[PDB]
Amino acid sequence: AATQEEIVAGLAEIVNEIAGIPVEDVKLDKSFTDDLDVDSLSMVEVVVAAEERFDVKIPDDDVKNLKTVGDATKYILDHQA
């Protein structure tokens, strides 16, 4: 529970392992599956991995609400603390 520097850095790392992105592409405003090229079905894992890592909690309605890491992160941080 810090901020974007926690989230993005971590979320990218999740996307690194889940799919195979480099930890520089996942910035913000990046459409995950659409921009980065992550598997949609695996994106759900990335979310539960994100929130468990960044101390936020993201319900499935918000999982599908986050279309980019811009969404995600803004949601996460803002809901962590």
- Nearest C-alpha neighbor of 40 from the set 64, 73, 13: 64
Let me know: does 19 contact 59? Beta carbons within 8 Å.
no
The helix-helix angle for 4-18 and 69-80 (nearest 10°) equals 130
Contact at 8 Å (CB) between 30 and 73?
Answer: no
Write out the catalytic residue numbers. Answer: 39
Structure method: NMR
* 17: region left, alpha or beta (phi > 0 left; psi from -120 to 50 alpha): alpha
Domain span at 73: 1-81
Planar angle of CA 39, 42, 46, nearest 5 degrees: 115
Task: Quote the radius of gyration of the chain (alpha carbons, Å).
Answer: 11
Q: Residue 49 maps to which CATH number?
A: 1.10.1200.10
Residue 81 Cα distances to 14, 24, 43, 56, 63, angstroms: 21, 25, 23, 8, 18
Number of domains in the chain: 1
Structure tokens at 60: 């499935």
